[PDB]
Amino acid sequence: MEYLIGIQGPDYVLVASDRVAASNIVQMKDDHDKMFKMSEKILLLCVGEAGDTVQFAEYIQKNVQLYKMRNGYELSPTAAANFTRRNLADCLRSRTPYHVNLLLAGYDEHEGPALYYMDYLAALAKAPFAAHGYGAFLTLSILDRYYTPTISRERAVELLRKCLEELQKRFILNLPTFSVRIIDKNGIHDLDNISFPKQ
Amino acid sequence: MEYLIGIQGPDYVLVASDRVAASNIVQMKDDHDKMFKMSEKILLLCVGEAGDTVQFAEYIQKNVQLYKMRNGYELSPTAAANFTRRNLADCLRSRTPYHVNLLLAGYDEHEGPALYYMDYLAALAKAPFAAHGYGAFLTLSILDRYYTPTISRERAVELLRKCLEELQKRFILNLPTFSVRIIDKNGIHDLDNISFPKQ
Amino acid sequence: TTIAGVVYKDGIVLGADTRATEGMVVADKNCSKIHFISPNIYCCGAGTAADTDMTTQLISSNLELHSLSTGRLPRVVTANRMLKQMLFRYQGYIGAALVLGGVDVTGPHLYSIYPHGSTDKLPYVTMGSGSLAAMAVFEDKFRPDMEEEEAKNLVSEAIAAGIFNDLGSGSNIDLCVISKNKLDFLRPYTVPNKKGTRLGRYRCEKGTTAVLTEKITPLE
Amino acid sequence: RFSPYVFNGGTILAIAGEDFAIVASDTRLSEGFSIHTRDSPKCYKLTDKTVIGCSGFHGDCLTLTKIIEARLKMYKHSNNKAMTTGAIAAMLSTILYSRRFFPYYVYNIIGGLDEEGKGAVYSFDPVGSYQRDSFKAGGSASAMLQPLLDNQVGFKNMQNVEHVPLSLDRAMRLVKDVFISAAERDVYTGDALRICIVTKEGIREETVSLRKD
Amino acid sequence: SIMSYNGGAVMAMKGKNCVAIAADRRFGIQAQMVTTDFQKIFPMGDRLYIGLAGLATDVQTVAQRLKFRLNLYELKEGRQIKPYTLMSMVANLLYEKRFGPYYTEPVIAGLDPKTFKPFICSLDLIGCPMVTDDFVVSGTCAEQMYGMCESLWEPNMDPDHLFETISQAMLNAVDRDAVSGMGVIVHIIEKDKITTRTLKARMD
Amino acid sequence: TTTLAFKFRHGVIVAADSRATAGAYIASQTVKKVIEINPYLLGTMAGGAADCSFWERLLARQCRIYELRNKERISVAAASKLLANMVYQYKGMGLSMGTMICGWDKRGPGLYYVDSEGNRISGATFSVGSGSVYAYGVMDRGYSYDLEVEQAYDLARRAIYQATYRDAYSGGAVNLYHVREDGWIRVSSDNVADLHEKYSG
Amino acid sequence: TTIMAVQFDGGVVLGADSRTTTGSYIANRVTDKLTPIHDRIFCCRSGSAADTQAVADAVTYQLGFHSIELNEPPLVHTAASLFKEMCYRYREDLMAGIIIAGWDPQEGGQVYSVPMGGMMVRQSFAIGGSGSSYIYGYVDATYREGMTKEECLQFTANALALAMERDGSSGGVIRLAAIAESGVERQVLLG
Amino acid sequence: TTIMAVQFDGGVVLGADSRTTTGSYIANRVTDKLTPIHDRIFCCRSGSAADTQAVADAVTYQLGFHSIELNEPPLVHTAASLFKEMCYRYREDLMAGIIIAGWDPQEGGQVYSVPMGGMMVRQSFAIGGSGSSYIYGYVDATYREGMTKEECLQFTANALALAMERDGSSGGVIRLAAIAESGVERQVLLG
Amino acid sequence: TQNPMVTGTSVLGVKFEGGVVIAADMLGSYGSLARFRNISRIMRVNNSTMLGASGDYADFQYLKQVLGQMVIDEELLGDGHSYSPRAIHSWLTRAMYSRRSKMNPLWNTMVIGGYADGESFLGYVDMLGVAYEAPSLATGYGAYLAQPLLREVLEKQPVLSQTEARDLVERCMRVLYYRDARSYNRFQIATVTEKGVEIEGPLSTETNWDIAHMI
Amino acid sequence: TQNPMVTGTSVLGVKFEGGVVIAADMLGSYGSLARFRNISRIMRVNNSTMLGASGDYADFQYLKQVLGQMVIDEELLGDGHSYSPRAIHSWLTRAMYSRRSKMNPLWNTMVIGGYADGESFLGYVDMLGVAYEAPSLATGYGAYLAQPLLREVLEKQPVLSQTEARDLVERCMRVLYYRDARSYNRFQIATVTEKGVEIEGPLSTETNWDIAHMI
């Protein structure tokens, strides 16, 4: 129902989500955040049920920080992503299954930037771009059209703005605002918020 | 799902609808019209199923025009509204029930302006204002707050603009454009279209 | 609902009660359950109230059509054949439980009719919800060829056993006595249940209710 | 297949007075379209100042009564005093919620005196929410008694009528009139009327007959 | 249920030489009201009214079908209709839809056209007539209306106290109901005139 | 059932109705739907009577022990989080709970929203209940952060009245609380029929 | 319900219980389970009560009309054919256990069996009803070819009383009937 | 399946068919439906095959262990109690039709009946199985108090053969057994 | 127990002057088949109280096993105490209520008659744990049939002698033979007094069939 | 027909040199009860063709009624023509297919044997209108049991005499007595030749039970 995006660059990862916390007709909150700083180079995006998003993703949030304090150094984005897949699959054939959809964004000092995809059935992937929600259908073929593996970080924002205007046009839900991050060798930088004057 | 509004004045009827013809995720048409000129002083608004809106409302459209050509004069808005209720109730306990929601807007030379409400179970009403769809919940208490039985036609447009901005704010569907009519002693006049620059 | 009938040495005594309920709320405190058919035949109704009313008026209209064309007194076996042939055609959709009784040239005849169309000639029958209570009074105290007041005492005893069971009545025990020549019909035969008096003051004041708008329209 | 619930009927009435409390109930126990007995009161003297009424499923009424009477003794030898009226209503709410996912089919009304000497009536639901009221009527005939007591006790929808507090003698004839009118239209009500009066001098009882049909 | 889709309450009460009838004003879908001027009492000749309650479709439908048959009756015969005759007419109309039934329960109140004798009756949704001598009620909040009428009714009442009794019976019972309210209109008729009053009720 | 809450410059306003029904039958008209947790915290009742009554009383049992062990009041974000974890363990078993948490904190005002489904969100304005959607429009048309104290009292009193008008499951009285920096204060409690003579006149 | 039919050299012997029940409550305590059609042809019915009473009236209407045209006494095989033409046609609508027996001048005693399906077959002896399953082992170990009339009345009296021993759809009283060339002897047995 | 047990003055007489079926297909054509527990106590089983074989092994384990401790021959009523303690406890899980019979030195011949419910009762004669409903009217009109051993072998042979006449869960071959103070005589009857 | 295999039927009981009489039949029917023609459905508890039951008979042998043990367990103490008939009625209700709470009930309906301290006792026990006291009891279809005959005499005459009570039971047991499909014409009568528990033999009824000669 | 009340069982059939032999038993079972021990399940059509059937027997009396009329209706013309055995197989298939299209089928399974113009004929008719020809046919459980015995001999020897065919049917009818729960030890054998239709009497089998003496 809510939207994610995963534009991967040569030395950067461009991610963005929406800011809607609706309840079945009404829109209770229009500045909601779905971005979880796991560490100093790894973010987390979570889309799913009502309680399963907050309970599981904070269980991962307060478990990667334990690795940092105890061993003195930081997880790689690959090992951090492949630990999250372990916890869904172990807690899938039980009385409490977690129904969330994830995508992970991290930068490595030895491997560069990385992106990982996650299903609600705990399937890992390594994608040059990814998305979730009902808006993933209308927007990814635009991103499949103009993608280049060697693309600058300024054209990626312009490609992100092309990706969101068609979601403003032919998608039934409202979705007015979109927060945007960026991850590089320096860390997580917060770009400006994206809003839409419609008419 | 789609929206109607029924602001009644002392000598005018202010009606407006939306212009969306969506298909389950996508929005196929953004200039759709739901306004049916039954005669020179009677409009018709129709909200319902896929085929039941066009098939039934044109059956009423090409049956009031028969009364005009055959008798030389025009139906009153009361008799025209109380004929539409006859056709749902007769065709309700059958194999083909029509599932539409209506509201009728007419002006009379002897009775002045009039508004009628219609359920999908063929229940008539005489209302000072009415609405339909899921947006009828969020907007009518605003219209219940500021309504005056002696209100000018200029304040009614301003009250209509107050009524639609909260539907832009806390309603999950998009609904960007809204066509507006007005009916007086001269006939049906077409006011300007209403659109929304969101941010 | 508790209806019953019996055949004594000269005729037939019928009995019923005076309550119709909707859900578990008493709708009526005085309802007539003994219906006219002919000047010698009566019929008690049980089951769905509107199904028994519209059925007992149609067949009574046909026998008035039949006997006036014939020119003589009707037969109870004719009303038996009309009811069980009609109710079989509706496949038990019309819920009607009837007790048919009357005196012909051949004598008294008592029947019991089920809503699928099965009929039984019996000397004593009970139908209704409290038919289980009234039947135990019969089998304990029935003997063949009773007298007039002996048979009237048995029916009013048997109906009262169902009244002090649930779905009883705001009791007005009804009796219809059919003999060879004399015909009786008694609505207030026994009132065992009384409503207590009201011990409170409920003085409604002339003006203790606010009125928004009045309107006067004379007549002639 | 086996079903664990059945409805038994009953009607319970309570009125909080200025310095008294009146608890009334019928003694008819029924099931379906049969009468088990005509002598089964719903009043239960818990303490010398608190009477509880229990309607609904009768098997849970016999169980829940004996659980409360056990915990009255468990309070006393642990605290060297008896429970108050408000303490029982706080204890009963935890007992009713303790079987939240297999609930008691019991409607409860507690009436009695507080520590100031005034009337107090607590009404309940089968899951355990409560509030203090002035008068409640629970049971099968609950809808037939609440609008009339709003007119007479609460003085609702009345014009130009002073608010005199209800005396003891006027409250007795209001209880005796509502059960006569309720036994006419309801089938789960009749055969007697047990009335318990809780004052500062003890608990009185009184029995008024009704129609027996 | 289907009866609980729009709500409603219709009460009639017999007096000494007069008869009264009252109903609510709220029109609405299951939890959302629409308007407060929905007519539920319809005049069928002078000194004889009818009240309808139930599904709002069949209220407006049966009141037009009964008016269709009444005007054809009052032209083949120069007389007006007797109150017993209308009860047999309505019971015929409901029983024709035996298995497709209308969802309403009519209440008929009126006087005799020759004498002053009042008449009250009510019917089921398939046409079971039921005449009484004190009161008849119909609608969703039926059980609250029995609790008020069994305690307040007196046998021989002037039109002053009869109005005050049916006022307190309607206000205290409908305020206990959730899906009924928003105003109560009361008709009180007699041999000489017809009086219509509206009451000051809770608008919540 | 209709509750609402909004925060502004001078604290938080809490308002609710008092009608509790049972199917189509009104049980009472004097139900106190705003549960007084502490002298510095307030909680609401929206959906389920005993479910909102038990777990907030269990939360008030927990916040007092936190004050004794640490010699300091609990924060507003702490109490809303403890309530969210207790309800989440019974997810899917059939609870109903849509309460709100109000109170002053060291960070200033505090307003969180807790569901039985597991939604814990902050915000500035909220409206919970069956007739909640009738209250969003009339509140947001008059809402501002820089409203006066007497102006904010009339806005919430108006918004409950318009909700009880259209909804059938809402009525009774209109309660009104005010959360100040030191603690909450009861403002008033007005009947709907008294407001009808005031507003329509 | 238990019905019984045994032919012998002269004619046939019929027999049945009464006990018309519903659920576990006896509605009718004494019942004519055997019904005259013609002066020499009876039938004993089983299954639904309202279904079998409607069929037995129509067959009596059709066969009674048919014999007046021919000016001849009807055949027992003719009467058993008419029940077949209604039960097979209106199947999935009726539950009838009709057994047809009677004397005929052309052929003597005959017994036919029409079960709930709609087939027709001639038998020497025939059982039927709900309680007939309990005496199936007794009725074939006791039957013997070449009985007299008084043996068959003794045979069906002991045969019914074992099904009428306690079984909840059976008991009550024994109604017997003997059809021969001379007349029809009907009697009620108790004690 | 049809099982049979009749006591007499000396001891008891058992008997059963074989025909273990499934659907409408015979899986086992000849079958030991009667099972030794002790030297003097047999049981004949009915119901589910896998359920009754598991119970009969456990009772033989428990009763066989119990008599060695007492250094006494066990009682027949003791063995019938052990089937009751398992069938009543593990009801809604088993479908067993156990009939226990055998000679005992203290009491002589005894016959007990444990149906699918779990109750226990002593009887003079006992039937059981699916085909037992067809001979219930024959077995009580033929039984007579004070039979010899050779009459009871004649009695159960005719009684089983009527249930084994054609009925689809029964037939095959007759296995008989006579238990007395002297020994156990088992024989197979055909033709 | 989810499916009652072998069931009983109606059990009667009524007080009189210094004792309680209880009667029931001797039938072990399985559905419509009457499989067991000779069983006892009345249990004699030690000297004052007494039990008859309906419903499933395999469950009745279980309660016959447990109640038989508890009476022996007190008599071996020899402390001059015994179970009152009201104490058996208290224990049996808690046994049935705790059994239905596990959703595995006992398919029974039980009538307890007792006489102690010069006082009669007559108690009812339901499957669902519903229990009360009454001067006359009837289970099954007997609550529809014999129960109006019981309450009719007890309102016109509140107390009864032993011969008036015993004659009244045989009238009600005669009635249940006519219209209960699971009845049986061989029953036994049990009676407590100050002398102790006494159970009569397999008595029979006397029927009338003179209406069979009518049409 | 939605519920078959009284059903039959397996019917066999095999060709030989100048004729077709068909055998079936004489049982009228109702579920598990064998209610009718003496019925005929083979119908002799006029002189060359011949019919045996399985499934519901009340439906078989209907087709016995209709086919009996059509043969009489042609013989009264006397134009020197008759129905071939293939023409009966054509008509009967269209009767069954048109009946299932109304969702009210005839619960039968029919085997048609005929001999005309020096040629044998053996046809199968299903309830669902499935029809074919075969040198050997078997219905019901016989298609699982006797059918492997039929195809084994016909592949090792394609043609058979009359005595070889008749002896082979009695072996297969012996087998079905051992393991079909609806079998019956009294059957009849029908055979067409150039001489016409001939039906033998109620023959029986000869069983072996020597493995019963083993453990």
Swiss-Prot record, chain C:
<dbReference type="GO" id="GO:0005654">
    <property type="term" value="C:nucleoplasm"/>
</dbReference>
<dbReference type="GO" id="GO:0000502">
    <property type="term" value="C:proteasome complex"/>
</dbReference>
<dbReference type="GO" id="GO:0019774">
    <property type="term" value="C:proteasome core complex, beta-subunit complex"/>
</dbReference>
<dbReference type="GO" id="GO:0005737">
    <property type="term" value="C:cytoplasm"/>
</dbReference>
<dbReference type="GO" id="GO:0004298">
    <property type="term" value="F:threonine-type endopeptidase activity"/>
</dbReference>
<keyword id="KW-0647">Proteasome</keyword>
<dbReference type="GO" id="GO:1904813">
    <property type="term" value="C:ficolin-1-rich granule lumen"/>
</dbReference>
<keyword id="KW-0539">Nucleus</keyword>
<comment type="function">
    <text>Component of the 20S core proteasome complex involved in the proteolytic degradation of most intracellular proteins. This complex plays numerous essential roles within the cell by associating with different regulatory particles. Associated with two 19S regulatory particles, forms the 26S proteasome and thus participates in the ATP-dependent degradation of ubiquitinated proteins.</text>
</comment>
<dbReference type="GO" id="GO:0005829">
    <property type="term" value="C:cytosol"/>
</dbReference>
<dbReference type="GO" id="GO:0005839">
    <property type="term" value="C:proteasome core complex"/>
</dbReference>
<feature type="active site" description="Nucleophile">
    <location>
        <position position="1"/>
    </location>
</feature>
Swiss-Prot record, chain E:
<comment type="subunit">
    <text>(Microbial infection) Interacts with HIV-1 TAT protein.</text>
</comment>
<dbReference type="InterPro" id="IPR033811">
    <property type="entry name" value="Proteasome_beta_3"/>
</dbReference>
<dbReference type="InterPro" id="IPR023333">
    <property type="entry name" value="Proteasome_suB-type"/>
</dbReference>
<dbReference type="InterPro" id="IPR029055">
    <property type="entry name" value="Ntn_hydrolases_N"/>
</dbReference>
<dbReference type="GO" id="GO:0000502">
    <property type="term" value="C:proteasome complex"/>
</dbReference>
<dbReference type="InterPro" id="IPR016050">
    <property type="entry name" value="Proteasome_bsu_CS"/>
</dbReference>
<comment type="function">
    <text>Non-catalytic component of the 20S core proteasome complex involved in the proteolytic degradation of most intracellular proteins. This complex plays numerous essential roles within the cell by associating with different regulatory particles. Associated with two 19S regulatory particles, forms the 26S proteasome and thus participates in the ATP-dependent degradation of ubiquitinated proteins.</text>
</comment>
<dbReference type="GO" id="GO:0005839">
    <property type="term" value="C:proteasome core complex"/>
</dbReference>
<comment type="similarity">
    <text>Belongs to the peptidase T1B family.</text>
</comment>
<dbReference type="GO" id="GO:0070062">
    <property type="term" value="C:extracellular exosome"/>
</dbReference>
<feature type="modified residue" description="N-acetylserine">
    <location>
        <position position="1"/>
    </location>
</feature>
<dbReference type="GO" id="GO:0005737">
    <property type="term" value="C:cytoplasm"/>
</dbReference>
UniProtKB/Swiss-Prot annotation, chains G, H:
<dbReference type="GO" id="GO:0000502">
    <property type="term" value="C:proteasome complex"/>
</dbReference>
<keyword id="KW-0888">Threonine protease</keyword>
<keyword id="KW-0963">Cytoplasm</keyword>
<feature type="modified residue" description="Phosphothreonine">
    <location>
        <position position="35"/>
    </location>
</feature>
<dbReference type="GO" id="GO:0005634">
    <property type="term" value="C:nucleus"/>
</dbReference>
<keyword id="KW-0007">Acetylation</keyword>
<dbReference type="GO" id="GO:0005829">
    <property type="term" value="C:cytosol"/>
</dbReference>
<dbReference type="GO" id="GO:0004175">
    <property type="term" value="F:endopeptidase activity"/>
</dbReference>
<comment type="similarity">
    <text>Belongs to the peptidase T1B family.</text>
</comment>
<keyword id="KW-0865">Zymogen</keyword>
<keyword id="KW-0645">Protease</keyword>
<dbReference type="GO" id="GO:0005737">
    <property type="term" value="C:cytoplasm"/>
</dbReference>
From Swiss-Prot, chains I, J:
<feature type="modified residue" description="Phosphotyrosine">
    <location>
        <position position="57"/>
    </location>
</feature>
<comment type="function">
    <text>Non-catalytic component of the 20S core proteasome complex involved in the proteolytic degradation of most intracellular proteins. This complex plays numerous essential roles within the cell by associating with different regulatory particles. Associated with two 19S regulatory particles, forms the 26S proteasome and thus participates in the ATP-dependent degradation of ubiquitinated proteins.</text>
</comment>
<dbReference type="GO" id="GO:0005739">
    <property type="term" value="C:mitochondrion"/>
</dbReference>
<keyword id="KW-0597">Phosphoprotein</keyword>
<keyword id="KW-0225">Disease variant</keyword>
<dbReference type="GO" id="GO:0043161">
    <property type="term" value="P:proteasome-mediated ubiquitin-dependent protein catabolic process"/>
</dbReference>
<dbReference type="GO" id="GO:0005839">
    <property type="term" value="C:proteasome core complex"/>
</dbReference>
<dbReference type="GO" id="GO:0019774">
    <property type="term" value="C:proteasome core complex, beta-subunit complex"/>
</dbReference>
<dbReference type="GO" id="GO:0005737">
    <property type="term" value="C:cytoplasm"/>
</dbReference>
<keyword id="KW-0007">Acetylation</keyword>
<comment type="similarity">
    <text>Belongs to the peptidase T1B family.</text>
</comment>
<keyword id="KW-0647">Proteasome</keyword>
